[PDB]
Amino acid sequence: SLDLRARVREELERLKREGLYISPKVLEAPQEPVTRVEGREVVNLASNNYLGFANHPYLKEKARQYLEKWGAGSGAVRTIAGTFTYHVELEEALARFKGTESALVLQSGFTANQGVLGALLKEGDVVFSDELNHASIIDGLRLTKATRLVFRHADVAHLEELLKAHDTDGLKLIVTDGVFSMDGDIAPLDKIVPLAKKYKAVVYVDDAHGSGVLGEKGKGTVHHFGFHQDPDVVQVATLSKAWAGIGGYAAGARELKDLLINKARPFLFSTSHPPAVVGALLGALELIEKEPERVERLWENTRYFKRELARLGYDTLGSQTPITPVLFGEAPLAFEASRLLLEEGVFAVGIGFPTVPRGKARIRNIVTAAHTKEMLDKALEAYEKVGKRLGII
Amino acid sequence: DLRARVREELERLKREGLYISPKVLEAPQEPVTRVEGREVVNLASNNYLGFANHPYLKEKARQYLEKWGAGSGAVRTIAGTFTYHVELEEALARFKGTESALVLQSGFTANQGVLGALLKEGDVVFSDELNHASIIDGLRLTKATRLVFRHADVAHLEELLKAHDTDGLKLIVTDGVFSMDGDIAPLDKIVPLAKKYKAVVYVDDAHGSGVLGEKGKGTVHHFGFHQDPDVVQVATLSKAWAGIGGYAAGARELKDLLINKARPFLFSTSHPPAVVGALLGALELIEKEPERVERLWENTRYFKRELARLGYDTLGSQTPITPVLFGEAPLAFEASRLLLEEGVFAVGIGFPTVPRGKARIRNIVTAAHTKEMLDKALEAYEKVGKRLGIIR
Ligand SMILES: *Cc1c(COP(=O)(O)O)cnc(C)c1O
Ligand SMILES: *Cc1c(COP(=O)(O)O)cnc(C)c1O
């Protein structure tokens, strides 16, 4: 009986009633630590441009080469006629970078979770998910017949308790964000991986925010804890953030690759990526090798920034990564703080309930290697000012 | 135990004949290309308009790449929306003749995004039984009641609309062009039936976009239902438009719902300058060169006519998707091997994927195919069909 326009109207009203309705801003200059929003130069702490690569001329030149050479599109899925020399070149470079036996590029970090989780899990397997796991993962799991258990965030005690209570002639898969998207804390892999080996279980790390951030040259969270050649650790990560393009990889055992080619639904049914994207990611792996400095500078800036927000008496939720949250509780106050920051030429988006828990709305700030001190001090200056008016310092 | 699970699963897949070993292309996506170090005529791509390697799209991508960089550094709804995303969605809607348009990460995730944003516990979906896998995943993530109607059977569809109602939303869901047989959804009859029972029509036009309607405005536009607010279309930009991503096109308010509720719009980085450049390019190009769409159909007709001359069954295909019936799957895969031996590259498809006595080779004719190329493929189809004794 219900019409379109009508259903859409009902649903936007509900979202406005619950305080959750969002109005995305449009950026009017390239993705850089300083950019234009609403016709004003702002300091940009909303991006995931961790290494300053989103507009770096090296990556742009590599993309230009490959675009000219090969074209604007693979005309098909990898498994029919969409695999070209350049996809292999990238997967070869990725594995070598990662120090994994293999690597496979899929169409996003988002679909990577669906693809790998779907390929790996059957009716009978048991999954142990961290409760704060990214939405991308929840969707992946929901498309499998596996028994889904949740453990309290980063709680290795509760995790162990659950591993004793659930066993299988099949597969036990512990699943965690490597770096938690909105909280900015690191999965305790030092303790999780050992625990995993004690109970014949496999560890799956979604390292969207660890890739290009954590470990020697940003080889990632797994590589940082030194578990990268363990055949019972699987890692999937986006190439959209620090590597500043699009797509996600799945890295580990040579035989894993060959399973995903055969069983991963987004690899089977969705076009492979064009030359320009693959060019740019080849470029990015080349660049981080030439310039490991950038990763140091990312952390100097992170430390400086977190220290000052602490000095001013902001709670940073014991963040350990360049992700530097500031909690506002209800979403309306989060969006307001965002508006006031922007008035001071500082861009940091308020985040609300679909994306982050109810009663736990925040502003995520994301310090990058490309941020200069001048920029970081302007943001703090503004955070001081905006914090005074709301009387939270 | 990971090695173990991987090993057991590849074994099962090899046992069941399902294991695949993708062939690697060594030259650009064109109607003639190199696979395994041989020049072939390429009828396996979705490069419908010859855009995958067209210098116009490459030059537009180059412009936008130079101007803007290698990446949006975020999801659209935080810090990933730039001028160029707006430019594209504005050009898309105007091209489509819809009130609005929104670009998502794929046609694949577009289904999940829009189906998820639109459906609540209580709604009823009527799916065509041959609907693309992409859709099944979308629906499986909603709390909607899922009903299936016999392929393109408007009679069974009507019967189901009498048998199931809701104070909520009735959504009929169909591929616009069906990927395997290349038949067109009967929208001429479906949309009227939909208006008779206060239901909304959802068309996945991955293979209609850039193919069907004036300048490939698509299946919806072809049947003249493009300004109806109760017809929703999602389609890939990866095939005829020869890049990546999918759009959702329709009512102004649909866009604003998807920005808010579509899970792949909220949780996946927006697409980089070069991709958006190329797609802007493609919409510009098809306007300048409506010829290409004509040429796609001339070649489709030419090719289907000759396969008929030789006495091949083309399954009443209506689209540049040209099946060629080989009956049993074994013979379909064999014919696929032998075509490639003659420098002709096409996909054999059999039982799990298509019914048991209806295995075929899918060919995809494009505007970029010349007659020389089409006659080489026919030459080969003649030869391989004689030796296998399925044609005079
Ligand atoms: C090709 C196709 C898809 C997937 O489009 P991608 O851009 O490859 O994700 C989805 N649905 C249908 C009907 C298709 O033909
Ligand atoms: C950003 C992110 C994703 C999605 O990455 P895309 O490739 O942009 O879809 C998935 N998981 C986590 C933890 C993320 O941070």
Author numbering:
A (entry chain D): 3 to 395
B (entry chain A): 5 to 396
Provide the publication's sentences verbatim.
We report a chemo-biocatalytic cascade for the synthesis of substituted pyrroles, driven by the action of an irreversible, thermostable, pyridoxal 5′-phosphate (PLP)-dependent, C–C bond-forming biocatalyst (ThAOS). The ThAOS catalyzes the Claisen-like condensation between various amino acids and acyl-CoA substrates to generate a range of α-aminoketones. Like other members of the AOS family, ThAOS forms a tight homodimer with the PLP cofactor bound at the interface between the two monomers, typical of type IV PLP-binding enzymes. We next characterized ThAOS thermostability, finding it stable at temperatures of up to 80 °C over 3 h.
We predict that Arg366 is involved in similar functions in ThAOS, allowing the biocatalyst to accept the observed broad range of AAs. The acceptance of acyl-CoA substrates ranging from C2–C8 is more difficult to understand since there is a lack of high-resolution structures of bacterial AOS:acyl-CoA complexes. However, the observation that ThAOS can use various acyl-CoAs suggests that the binding site is suitably dynamic to accommodate a broad range of acyl chains.
